[model samples]
Target: MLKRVEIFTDGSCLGNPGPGGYGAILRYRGREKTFSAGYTRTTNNRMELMAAIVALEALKEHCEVILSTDSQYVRQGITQWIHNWKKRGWKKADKKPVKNVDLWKRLDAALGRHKIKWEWVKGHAGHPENERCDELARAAAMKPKLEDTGYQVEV
Candidate 1:
C-alpha cells in the first residue's frame, strides 16, 4: 500500500448531446498525472462519470483514493443511489430507467478496487485543481474525438 492519492475530475460537453470530454488529475507521491479523452456524441453526465472511472482505473494497485468532483450525480449515485438502484434493478423509485447506467456499471467495477472518499464541490469555484481539471476537459473536446461504438445506445 502507498500514501493516499488525491484526484480532481471534471467533464464538459459543447452541447447537451454533442462533443464531450472528461479530465482527471491524480496527485500521488508529490507528483501529478492527468488523463483525458473525448467523444463526439455523448452527454455531460456520461463524461462526468467517465472521468472518475478512468481516474481510478489508472491506478496500478489497490489504494486509498480521495476523489473530488463537481457532480452531484456522481457523488450521490456512488454513495447513495447506487445501492438502492442496484437493489431495484437499476430503476428509480418511480421505476424509470436510470440514466447513464452503462457508465455507472463501469464505475462500479472500479469502485471495488479502491477505497474512495467522495467530495462533491460546486462547479466554477476558484479551486485551483478543479479549474485545471475543467481546462483539460474543455481541451479534450478540441482534440479529434475517438470512437465509442460501445455507446451505440447513447442519447
Candidate 2:
C-alpha cells in the first residue's frame, strides 16, 4: 500500500535583498515534518524556491508528492516553463540566461525522481500549515543573527 504525501511551503525576506528565510511542512501517512532555515542575505524568490527544494530533498526516497507553494516562480517555473527553458539550453525566451539557474537545475533534478504535483496557494489565506510556514519564515528573517542553509557555493 502507498500513502499519499503532501507539503506546503513559504518564504519571506525582510528587505527583498536582506535577511531571508524559508519554511516547509511535509505530511506523509499521518506523520508531519517541518523545515525552516534562515540566510543573512537573499531575496524572497530565492527563499520560496529553496523551501520547496529543501522539502523535496528531505524525502528519503522517490515517492508521489503534492507540493504547494505561494510563489509563482516556483510553481510556474517547475510546472510550466522549465521545459521551454531546458529546450533552450536553460536560456530564457529572450535568449538571456535564467537567473538562479543553479537552484532551478537542482530543483528540477530532485523533482525528476519523484511523481510530484505542483500547486499554488494564496498567501495569508486561512490555511493553517501555510500560515504557520509564513510565520516561521518571517520570524526567521527578523532575527539579527542567522545561519546559512548551505544552499550556495563559495566564491
Candidate 3:
C-alpha cells in the first residue's frame, strides 16, 4: 500500500529572536503522532520551518504528504520562491541573501523525501488542530532553553 500522511504544524516564540518552539501533528491511516521541540534562541520563521522539517524527518519511508500550516512562508516558499532561489544560487528575487538559510536548506532536503501538498490556513481562528499546535509550541518555548545546535544567527 502507498504511504500517505497528513500533518498540521505551528510555530511560536516568546519574542522574535527569543526562545522558540515548533509543534507538529502527523496522521497516518487514522493514527497520529505529535512532535515538538524548543530552541534557546530563534525566530518564528525558523520554528515554522522547523515544524515541517521535523514532521518530514519522522517519515521512515516515501509517502504522500498533506501539510497544513498557518505560515505562507512555508507554503509559498516551497511552492514558488525556492525554485527561483535554487536557480539563482539561493538568492531572493531582489538578489539579497535568504534569511534562515540553514532551516531552508533542511526543509529543502525533507521536501525531496515525499510528494507534498501544501495547505495554508488562517491561524488562531478556532481551528482545533492549529490551536492545539499553537499551544504546544508556546508551552515548549516557555520551557528552559535547549541547545540550538548548528544555528548561528547573523546580527
Candidate 4:
C-alpha cells in the first residue's frame, strides 16, 4: 500500500547572512508533525533548503510525499534546474559556480531517497499552514544567539 504525505515549509533570515531559521509541517495518515530550527549564522536559501530537508528526513520511509515550499530556490532547484547543473558538473550553463552547492547537494540526495512532488506557493498568502510555518521561521530568525536547530545531520 502507498501512503500519502503532505508537507509545508518556510525559511527566514533576519539579516541576509545573519540569524536564520527554517520551519516545516508534515501530515501523514491523518497525523501532523511540526519541525523548526534556528541558526546563529546562515542565509535565507540555506534556511529554506533546511526546512525541506527536515521535512523529508522526518518521514519514516518510502512514502509518497507532496512537499510545498515558498522558496523558488528549493522548488526550482529540485524540479527544474538541478538536472542541468548536475550535468554541467554542478556549474551553471554560464560556467558560474553554483552558490550553496553544499546544501543543494545534500537536499538533492535526501530528495532522491523518496518519491516526492515539489510545489511552490506564494509566501504570506492565506495558506494557513504555510503562513504558520513562515511565522515560525521569521520568529526563529529574530531570536538572539539561537542554536542550530536543524543541524542534526552533517551537511
Best by lDDT: 3
TM-score of each: 0.89, 0.87, 0.90, 0.86
Report clash pairs, candidate 1: none
What would the per-residue lDDT of candidate 4 be over residues 80-124, giving only the tens digit for each residue? 789998989899878888877877887888888888887778756
lDDT values, one for every candidate: 0.85, 0.82, 0.85, 0.82
| Candidate 3 TM-score to native | 0.90
lDDT of 3 by residue, 15-110 (tens): 887899989999988888998888898888888998899989999999999988899778778878888888889887787888777888898999
- Winning candidate number (TM-score): 3
Off by over 4 Å in 3: 93-95
Q: How many clashes in each candidate?
A: 0, 0, 0, 0
lDDT score, candidate 1, position 94: 89
Q: How many backbone clashes does candidate 4 have?
A: 0
Give candidate 1's error at residue 20 in angstroms.
0.6
**Clashing residue pairs, candidate 4?**
none
The better candidate by TM-score, 3 or 4, is: 3
